[PDB]
Design a protein around this ligand. Structure first.
Ligand SMILES: O=P(O)(O)O[C@H]1[C@H](OP(=O)(O)O)[C@@H](OP(=O)(O)O)[C@H](OP(=O)(O)O)[C@@H](OP(=O)(O)O)[C@H]1OP(=O)(O)O
Ligand SMILES: O=P(O)(O)O[C@H]1[C@H](OP(=O)(O)O)[C@@H](OP(=O)(O)O)[C@H](OP(=O)(O)O)[C@@H](OP(=O)(O)O)[C@H]1OP(=O)(O)O
Ligand code: NA
Ligand SMILES: [Zn+2]
Ligand SMILES: [Zn+2]
Lengths: 384, 455
RNA sequence: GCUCGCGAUGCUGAGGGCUCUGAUAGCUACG
RNA sequence: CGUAGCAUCAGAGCCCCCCAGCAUCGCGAGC
């Protein structure tokens, strides 16, 4: 009921589990089967009374190359922790609309207006990420197993494999370094059979630890937001996790003025979670506070089982962003740059988020850790 | 509704024969057959139930009327003279023929070179029957030469994407056909060429070439989403490493030979764009155009990744604004079809070699895609030097008054090419059409590569 | 300490095949 | 009113084949 780091971790684990149970008919629903669960919890104080479960999700798979959407209707990455961040973005958009509904609703929105233009979180509002296991890539690859009291730390931390950017590789096991032989995916290349490379969860969480979790579109309204803590339900290796999350790019420099290399609390839970039996389900559930029920997405297609777009896809998010843009006065924008109303350009209007991304990519390259691998440029050239 | 189930309700006593299996892992291919009302049908797929469902598809479509029609899966018919059969049946015939001949050249798909990502081929039609179609050439490959291996003297291939190799081996077929006409007064009836009223030669009537590619060609014809089938036509260049393409920016300088080893790479055009180019200046190239009138593909069959709207854009529609073309040149609008038993995607690395074979060769030639030369470092039969040698042989034989464009004592490859006045003018109009459509400059590779001579 | 080459034992998303079980939509046959 | 037999999903069991990294250990070499 109080908040020192271990009981905070145990509390967020408790909360995400319990919310998941409520949404799955006390874990009796067919959509309770999972190999990885992840969740976001918001805190407003030292009291579990004030702590609320912002989102929950599951999933261990990414999209098949054939199913990338040139309209932003599919989910590329259904690892449970990626999905939980996207559900958090739905919550952030909803809180912006709650804010500017009327001057009486504004006091219940988590945002205020900011001295530097745009909007920011109100004080002592924090976000905690929970994952039932360690994130693929640098935080996991070297030790995919529960730790032991006997020699817990890494015996070879100076190997060049340590810290490397690594891609999930379509149809292959493992997470693969960005070998210096090629770095450009092409849309036609991938449809043909080049395997879709998707940066590992450890790398995405490092990137969120530089540019914030709110993405580029939301940064046009809101100052960057960062996870206060990362809590792992099993497979917690501290040296590996802290390497993966921030310590490998401490060489980053020249970040634009609100951005920083965030170093959230990392922690495991008291009673580590149990490896779930059975095959891993091919679906991913997701829930954001203020939803009546879970949404279930087929991870390999990026869409629900009837083929509808997720409330979490590029296109739905873009639509949320436009709803808010329409209600935001021109003077209150964090960027007055004008860009056409296509997903890719609208993102380019986040000039200093883009600059931050550049410093990130440079830090990895200078560090010898490889060049970040992006999606085919055609992925984001769509309109509403 | 599921085809196997519908056919079971129709003819409940179903025996499906399992015709054995090919490949392993993702390159698995099963074939499943059934006999309905006396006729014998086939289906191909990665897994038995898909092969079975496609056999049942052939069944219900052949014995009864068609099936589901997604719409992008249905095909643009050609510009005029809808000659050769139903579009789908011609498509499936062509794809079977190329796939068969590839089997023949690879000891029924067992040889080490049978493993491939893209298979392409050219098939010649001479009548309305599909009995006397004939495979002219067969090729594979999805890689290009590295600039470290380009030749100042014409001994290396630049581009080994399957369809490009297919066209060049076609050119070998065309030199052979002219040599056939010339070397004996009687072999003219056997040839595909005849003398042209405008001078030079032209193809005999109803001789058509059909291009087959196991996938939509790289570049603009592939920039779309296969499962949302309901988008701007830029030019693109192949990238330094691996398959696929990126669009060109019009403001980048044209290449100069040493300076594109020092700086920006020696970029090569995407297959979608090269095939639009072929739809304007024809497939025979410039040298052959000194001897022959322009030749055009009549069909383009895609063994997978077919979508009618985007293929149409990439092949002709995106330069429908071209005008002022030389005599005999046109914007060719061929048939665009997919096939019934479409190929599955095989995620994985593309092989490093390119197989090529023309009708008349006795065995495949295996080229290292990255060196543009064969297994033993020799120049292939397709490189610029060898083709110019064929062309010079043919120039030694044509009387000077039969040349469609006058040239005497040819010495330099580039000079001989420049002699093709009208072809170079059609090339100029194609480049103009692309620029004025807002789609980009053609990346002309440095012409110092063509400053060489036979001896 | 690392890197490179060779070797060994394991670890960690695809494809394929076969068997069982429940539904759902069918289709026959018989009393 | 039942039983038997002849596409979908959904779950379970037994196999085969990848994947390109990673761990641990050996051998040779270089820094
Ligand atoms: O991490 P994910 O949840 O999978 O989504 C991200 C996100 O794109 P979307 O929020 O539009 O889906 C990034 O965009 P930002 O949030 O940083 O604005 C984008 O990176 P870019 O903005 O630089 O395009 C990145 O795509 P990429 O992999 O090309 O970096 C993409 O990750 P995935 O492509 O793996 O979904
Ligand atoms: O089949 P490709 O590999 O695409 O070869 C063509 C062909 O070159 P060669 O005939 O010497 O092999 C073209 O020549 P023509 O058929 O038009 O005579 C030439 O175009 P030029 O007319 O400008 O020589 C073009 O090169 P480019 O892209 O520079 O126009 C070149 O394609 P590659 O250069 O990519 O091999
Ligand atoms: Na990107
Ligand atoms: Zn992950
Ligand atoms: Zn190509």
């Amino acid at each position: 009921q109080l908040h020192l780091p271990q009981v905070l971790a145990d509390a967020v684990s408790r909360l995400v589990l319990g919310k998941f149970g409520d949404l799955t008919d006390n874990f009796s629903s067919p959509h309770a089967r999972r190999k990885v669960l992840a969740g976001v919890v918001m805190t407003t104080g030292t009291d579990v009374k004030d702590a609320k479960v912002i989102s929950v999700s599951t999933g261990t798979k990414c999209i098949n190359g054939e199913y990338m959407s040139d309209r932003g209707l599919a989910l590329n990455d259904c690892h449970a922790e990626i999905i939980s961040r996207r559900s958090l973005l739905r919550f952030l958009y909803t809180q912006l609309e709650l804010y500017l509904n009327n001057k009486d609703d504004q006091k219940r929105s988590i945002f205020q207006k900011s001295e530097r233009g745009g909007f920011r979180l109100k004080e002592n509002v924090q976000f905690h990420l929970y994952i039932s296991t360690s994130p693929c890539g640098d935080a996991r690859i070297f030790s995919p197993h529960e730790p032991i009291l006997e020699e817990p730390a890494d015996r070879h931390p100076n190997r060049k494999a340590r810290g490397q950017l690594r891609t999930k590789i379509e149809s292959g096991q493992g997470t693969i370094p960005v070998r210096s032989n090629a770095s450009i995916q092409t849309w036609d290349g991938v449809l043909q059979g080049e395997r879709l490379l998707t940066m590992s969860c450890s790398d995405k969480i490092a990137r969120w630890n530089v540019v914030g979790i709110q993405g580029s579109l939301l940064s046009i309204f809101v100052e960057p937001i960062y996870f206060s803590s990362i809590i792992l339900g099993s497979l917690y290796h501290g040296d590996h996790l802290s390497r993966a999350m921030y310590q490998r790019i401490s060489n980053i420099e020249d970040l634009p003025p609100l951005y920083t290399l965030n170093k959230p609390l990392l922690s495991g839970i008291s009673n580590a979670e149990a490896r779930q039996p059975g095959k891993a389900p091919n679906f991913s559930v997701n829930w954001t506070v203020g939803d009546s029920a879970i949404e279930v997405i087929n991870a390999t297609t990026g869409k629900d089982e009837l083929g509808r777009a997720s409330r979490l896809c590029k296109h739905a998010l873009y639509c949320r962003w436009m709803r808010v843009h329409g209600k935001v006065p021109s003077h209150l924008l964090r960027s007055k740059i004008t860009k056409p109303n296509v997903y890719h350009e609208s993102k380019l209007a986040a000039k200093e988020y883009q600059a931050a991304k550049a410093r990130l990519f440079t830090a990895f390259i200078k560090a010898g850790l490889g060049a970040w691998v992006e999606k085919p440029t055609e992925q984001d050239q769509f309109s509403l």
